């Protein structure tokens with residue numbers, strides 16, 4: 146049950162990412178990592194199979210071990226994607242999103258202070274959308290970015306996936 150033919154929708158999501166990066170010195174510094182965040186998205190449906198959406202997401206590193214040492218991590222990004230779906234039932238859609246994202250990571254260190262980073266990256270998602278009612282739908286989605294990137298020195302990697310639950314309102 147995708148949104149009706151030339152209509153708009155909006156929504157919000159809560160996300161979790163199990164590690165969107167990772168650090169190290171021989172010698173270990175943190176123990177493992179968790180990021181939690183949220184995001185908002187809006188889109189336009191063209192027909193039952195295709196829509197286009199815009200979203201903004203934010204992720205924050207969650208505080209959890211000591212052993213001296215580390216600090217704050219925040220990521221944010223605006224994305225523009227084409228959403229391709231197929232109706233499995235009258236209520237359940239399966240879809241993928243493909244497009245691009247402009248992001249920014251802001252770090253912090255006690256030694257080094259504040260640092261930032263910027264990027265442009267392809268984004269991909271696979272998910273399920275369930276129409277509770279004709280105006281309210283929930284989504285279960287896994288989003289990933291594959292990373293290649295221009296820079297430094299020479300590129301290697303690790304951005305990882307984000308899992309999320311969302312709700313959206315359809316202005317039919």
Ligand SMILES: CCCCCCCCOCCOCCOCCOCCO
Pocket residue numbers: 189197225226227244
């Ligand atoms: C993958 C890149 C994103 C490309 C998608 C952009 C899609 C843009 O078009 C969306 C449709 O928006 C058009 C509506 O405006 C019509 C208003 O009413 C007309 C006067 O009565």
